[PDB]
């Protein structure tokens, strides 16, 4: 996260760290959607251009974290993966279309003050909140700059940008399975997700029922926090039917 702030304790209790067993490092962000299911970006697990192809046994999910590096004894819970599920039509070749993956935990995670699942939007929640100008929140332990590493979880609030403005900011082809967010150069305010933030959630707080909904997944960008550029997110509601199918097994 570039131009964000340190998160408050328990501010994002669905925040998940995808952790590589060897070498011991940060792989990606992710989110807790139930006691047994974790949502991430498919590119965190499968990305042939960079020789990325992780199997269940290659990583761990670390839930309830705040500090990036320290083992948070009596706070975080570390879980092993039973099974990975990548969207069958995930497009890593061109534009990261349908950049979504589900991960089943070996054992259910126990909820606490620091561990709690985020809601997934229904059709109406998605229609009422996914509007240009409406702000969402992105969290992660990713790069503080495009070319620093934070001590604690970072947070940034960013407005959803109009589809023509997203389309006009890049040469990459944009689909209905993605949206873009961030400030324009005229707005003054800054902020963006960056490398290491991938797979993390873009959330919004419903003004109707006061619950937090995950509307997006950190997917891609071209650089980080560049003027006239925007961060791209997987549109969660557009792929909810695949999500429901995998969970219903």
């Amino acid at each position: 996260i570039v131009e964000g702030s340190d998160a408050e304790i328990g501010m994002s209790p669905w925040q998940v760290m995808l952790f590589r067993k060897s070498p011991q490092e940060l792989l990606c962000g992710a989110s807790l959607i139930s006691d047994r299911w974790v949502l991430t970006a498919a590119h965190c697990l499968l990305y042939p251009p960079w020789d990325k192809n992780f199997t269940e046994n290659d990583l761990l999910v670390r839930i309830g974290k705040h500090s990036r590096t320290r083992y948070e004894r009596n706070i975080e819970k570390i879980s092993m993966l039973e099974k990975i599920y990548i969207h069958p039509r995930y497009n890593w070749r061109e534009n990261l279309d349908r950049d979504i993956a589900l991960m089943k935990l070996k054992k259910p995670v126990a909820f606490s003050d620091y561990i709690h699942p985020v809601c997934l939007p229904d059709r109406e929640t998605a229609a009422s909140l996914l509007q240009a100008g409406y702000k969402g929140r992105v969290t992660g332990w990713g790069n503080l700059k495009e070319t620093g590493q934070p001590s604690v979880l970072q947070v940034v609030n960013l407005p959803i940008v109009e589809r023509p403005v997203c389309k006009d900011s890049t040469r990459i082809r944009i689909t209905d399975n993605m949206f873009c967010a961030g400030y324009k150069p005229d707005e003054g305010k800054r902020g963006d997700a960056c490398e290491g933030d991938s797979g993390g959630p873009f959330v919004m707080k419903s003004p109707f029922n006061n619950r937090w909904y995950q509307m997006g997944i950190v997917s891609w960008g071209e650089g980080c926090d560049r003027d006239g550029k925007y961060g791209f997110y997987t549109h969660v509601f557009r792929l909810k039917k695949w999500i429901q199918k995998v969970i219903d097994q």
Partner: peptide, 27 residues
């Protein structure tokens, strides 16, 4: 489900520092 309600915030009726910024954007 108790999804999206944070034990340290919504469950205690405490607001985080920037959530009002999100609400104010929902014009």
């Amino acid at each position: 489900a108790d999804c999206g309600l944070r034990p340290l915030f919504e469950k205690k009726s405490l607001e985080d520092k920037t959530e009002r910024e999100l609400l104010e954007s929902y014009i």
